[PDB]
Task: structure prediction
Amino acid sequence: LALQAKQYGDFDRYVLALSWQTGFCQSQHDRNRNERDECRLQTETTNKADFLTVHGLWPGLPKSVAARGVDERRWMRFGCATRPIPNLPEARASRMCSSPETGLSLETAAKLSEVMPGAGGRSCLERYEYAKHGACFGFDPDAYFGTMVRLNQEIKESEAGKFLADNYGKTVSRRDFDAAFAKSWGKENVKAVKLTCQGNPAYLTEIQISIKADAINAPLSANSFLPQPHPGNCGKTFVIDKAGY
Ligand SMILES: [Ca+2]
Result:
């Protein structure tokens, strides 16, 4: 089912946010944070690429919102909660479950759980994510979360996901990662990716990909991406963290 905005739909992109699950857990641990049930339960699996989980799908700054004075950073920080508009209740990471239940169908909830360990349960990551990046757009939750799942799978199945899989636990260079990405989607789209790392030596924690708003309901190709200015804080070499602290 197609993902369509009903309000503030005049934005040009979506940032698919994927996290290297193992790395994510590794960081929460090293920062001395409380271990979540998703990390405490985290365990080794057959397809290493499956460690690439869904974090979210974030629409870019809507022109109609920018027109009212909202800037890129404010948008990145508050999303649907920016003022003067859309001005919806702020979604807080410290109380994700306090955000409104999305209305996601049981079927889509199950598909999401398989790839978004933080969804539902006592985390409620999907409520936080929808309140911040979807509610103000009137997105059908099913089409919204259903699209994240699809995109995550296509990524995992491309040379990008395979790259991660083959270098599981190894140190890689941003250069080769870029070649892996460019291999499936073109050299010119390498700048659509922002990588996030933690620690020193740096290890991967998240992958952010800029996708054209107009190409969101189609299988990814070399015309689905938009370059963006932030390479990330990973440096030219980083580690594809393995499961376990
Ligand atoms: Ca680890």
Observations:
- The longest strand covers residues 203-212.
- Residues 22, 26, 241-245 surround calcium ion (CB under 6 Å).
- Residues 120 and 235 are 34 Å apart (CA to CA).
- Residues 1-245 form a domain with the Ribonuclease Rh; Chain A fold (CATH 3.90.730.10).
